[PDB]
Ligand binder design. Structure first.
Ligand SMILES: Nc1nc2c(ncn2[C@@H]2O[C@H](COP(=O)(O)OP(=O)(O)O)[C@@H](O)[C@H]2O)c(=O)[nH]1
Ligand SMILES: C[C@H]1CCC/C=C/[C@@H]2C[C@H](O)C[C@H]2[C@H](O)/C=C/C(=O)O1
Ligand SMILES: [Mg+2]
Lengths: 155, 193
């Protein structure tokens, strides 16, 4: 919750959390962990626009946003961009630090970090503290380098 | 011919539990189920030998067939004279709610249309009903999923729903009644049959 992790289905969010890492409850599949004394929670963006107003109070303590993208997924990169931008438009996340995990860099034909940067529009985010990190969530490569940057931005 | 049809029926249900699509495909090809959303939903609704998590998984697919089944399945429920939580407790016993927000969303909107039809005049629009219903699913997860560290008080819940009523607020007592219901009794985990 102090850090939120967002990304399209199949980006690798659950995979990353198992790197950082039960009783039945009806409801949302909450994934959360404490890492280095900071709470990280996957925030599932899968509903309609209409239910986003309900979210607001939850983001009051949120200081950082991890955005995870499947770098091998050229057909959905624009939809990822639109989601990132939706999240960055939340009033309560105005000052949130942004870390982008350019994930699935192990795949032979994945877009590189420079291309992902262009396509997610990071260069247009002139008043935002952001960083992009190349990652392979299955092997763990790049994850801790990105989290270390984010850690340090929080103070 | 009767012991034989019963054996095919039992096999269809087993195949449904493993792979909903495939089990429905087996039933339809073997002439034990009409291939219409209405007849499939009637087969699922209180169906003996069907795993409620399979039922939920099947109802939560995005394919148009499944969305039509979902609406006909919602249509089987009787929500008249119930408050929202009481109606949700009935709906959510019929199948295991998936965990993905996209699916919960679509299911709450479908539930909403029938809630309002059963109870005209309780809410001013179906969207108000749908957003409130979704906030109840959030409240049940918030309160009763132990991974959620800090829980909403009443006051957070009333505040979350500010403005959902076509710009305005619902009466505080209606929200409090929903909050207290969920606080003292989580949605039950459904059991098969
Ligand atoms: N090739 C490869 N696969 C990955 C990577 N990260 C995750 N995956 C796989 O991608 C799929 C979706 O990952 P998951 O963590 O479930 O995505 P989620 O929907 O964002 O939680 C799974 O099959 C993962 O094993 C990666 O860096 N490289
Ligand atoms: C702090 C808790 C509160 C539980 C209720 C919140 C549910 C969110 C609703 C959002 O549409 C998807 C869920 C979103 O993924 C929330 C994850 C989570 O851990 O949230
Ligand atoms: Mg996941």
């Amino acid at each position: 919750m102090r850090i939120l992790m967002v990304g399209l289905d199949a980006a690798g969010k659950t995979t990353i959390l198992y790197k950082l890492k039960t009783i039945p409850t009806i409801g949302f599949n909450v994934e959360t962990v404490e890492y280095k004394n900071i709470s990280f929670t996957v925030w599932d963006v899968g509903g309609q626009d209409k239910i986003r107003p309900l979210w607001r109070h939850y983001f009051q303590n949120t200081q950082g946003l991890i955005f995870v993208v499947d770098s091998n997924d050229r057909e959905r990169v624009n939809e990822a961009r639109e989601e990132l931008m939706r999240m960055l438009a939340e009033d309560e996340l105005r000052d949130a630090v942004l870390l982008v995990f350019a994930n699935k860099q192990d795949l032979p034909n994945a877009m590189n970090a420079a291309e992902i940067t262009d396509k997610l529009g990071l260069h247009s985010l002139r008043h935002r503290n952001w960083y992009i990190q190349a990652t392979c969530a299955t092997s763990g490569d790049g994850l801790y380098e990105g989290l270390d940057w984010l850690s340090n931005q929080l103070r | 011919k009767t012991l034989q049809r019963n054996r095919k029926m039992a096999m269809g249900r087993k195949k449904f539990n493993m792979d909903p699509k495939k089990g429905i495909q087996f039933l339809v090809e073997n002439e034990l189920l009409q291939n219409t959303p209405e007849e499939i939903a009637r087969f699922l609704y209180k169906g003996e030998g069907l795993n409620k998590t399979a039922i939920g998984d099947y109802l939560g697919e995005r394919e148009e067939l499944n969305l039509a089944v979902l609406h006909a399945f919602v249509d089987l429920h009787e929500f008249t004279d119930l408050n929202l939580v009481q109606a949700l407790r009935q709906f959510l016993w019929s199948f295991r709610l998936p965990g993905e927000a996209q699916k919960i969303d679509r299911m709450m909107e479908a539930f909403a249309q029938r809630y309002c039809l059963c109870n005209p005049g309780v809410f001013q629009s179906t969207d108000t009903c749908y957003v409130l219903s979704y906030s109840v699913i959030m409240l049940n997860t918030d309160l009763h999923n132990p991974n959620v560290r800090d829980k909403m008080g009443l006051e957070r819940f009333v505040a979350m729903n500010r403005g959902i009523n076509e710009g305005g607020d619902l009466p505080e007592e209606l929200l409090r009644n929903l909050y207290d219901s969920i606080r003292n009794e989580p949605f039950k985990i459904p059991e098969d049959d």
